[PDB]
Structure formats: structure tokens, C-alpha cells
Chain length 97, copies 2
């Protein structure tokens, strides 16, 4: 099954991590990115980005701090379901020929 | 849920005007299938919008029994996520 791959940082500063990853073209409608300080100090944060993105800047971080980052591909599927049928027999007017 | 109360409202020598009931907005459309009863493998299929409660079957043979089936059709939307990809990264600078 499809999934994001190759999660790296392309840039780091004292308060940011610029993420980069790969994914099959149009496999995903969006990405869910979850991040939190690794020791679990501070809030777990959830963000969404468009499915065409392959990079994202995590900003407003604390210096010298380890973060656990998770990325999920998100996909929508549309299908049609069918009820059980209702059936009846009817006869047209007139004389059979 | 499913359509209920399939009847004809009108019959002529060449037509059957179908009528049925369904809960408001239960279905996005209806599938109607019909064929001469004493016949196999000549079925006719069509769809109508989910707001409709009648449909005219025309160009039929006189004095002939027809089997008619109606299905309620609903559009299902699914939202799913892949397996996560996870990594740990350290920001720049000195921890405080
Ligand atoms: Na779901």
C-alpha cells in the first residue's frame, strides 16, 4: 500500500525544522503531520497539508530540542452502494399476440 | 434501508408508469431494472435521481408480464490514512 517515504529535514534552525518527504504522485489528497517534543514535553500538534506538497516548515520550536515527527498520507475514496432490490411483476394492457 | 411500495400508477398497452416510496434523501439515486418475466438475459437498466418517486416504462409489448426491480443507490465517501512514516529530529542551538 502507498505511504510517504524518505522523511528528512532539508533545513534546521534554532526554532524550525523544514521537512521533506516523497510520495506517489496523486496517491494522497492531503498529508497529516503530527509532531511533539520527543520526551513529550509540550503539546502534540496536528497539521494538514495539501497532497501536492513534499515539504513543510515546522516553526516556533524550542532550541536544542528533539522532536518526533509522523507523517500520514490521507486519501478519500468515493464508491456506490446498492440497497436490496424491491421487485414486483406487472402486466401491460391489451391482448397478448 | 430500501425502496418500498413498488406499484404502477398507470398501465397502457405499451407502458407501465412505476411509482415507489423511499425516506426523504435516503438515496442519491435509484437503479431500475426490468425485463419480460418469461425471458432471461435481456434485462434493461437505467438510473433516476434520488428525488424521483415515479418513472414511465414505454415501448412495451401488450398483454405481457414484466418483472421490475428497484434498488436504492447511495454514494459512500471514505476517508483513510496510510501507515505513518516517523522520524526524530533535533532543532539547532543549545537546550535551555
Ligand atoms: Na474512514
Amino acid at each position: 500500500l502507498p505511504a510517504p517515504k524518505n522523511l528528512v529535514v532539508s533545513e534546521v534552525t534554532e526554532d524550525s525544522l523544514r521537512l521533506s518527504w516523497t510520495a506517489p504522485d496523486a496517491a494522497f489528497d492531503s498529508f497529516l503531520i503530527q509532531y511533539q517534543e520527543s520526551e513529550k514535553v509540550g503539546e502534540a500538534i496536528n497539521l494538514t497539508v495539501p497532497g501536492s506538497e513534499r515539504s513543510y516548515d515546522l516553526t516556533g520550536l524550542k532550541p536544542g530540542t528533539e522532536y518526533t515527527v509522523s507523517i500520514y498520507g490521507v486519501f478519500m475514496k468515493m464508491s456506490l452502494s446498492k440497497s436490496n432490490p424491491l421487485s414486483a411483476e406487472f402486466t401491460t394492457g391489451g391482448h397478448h399476440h
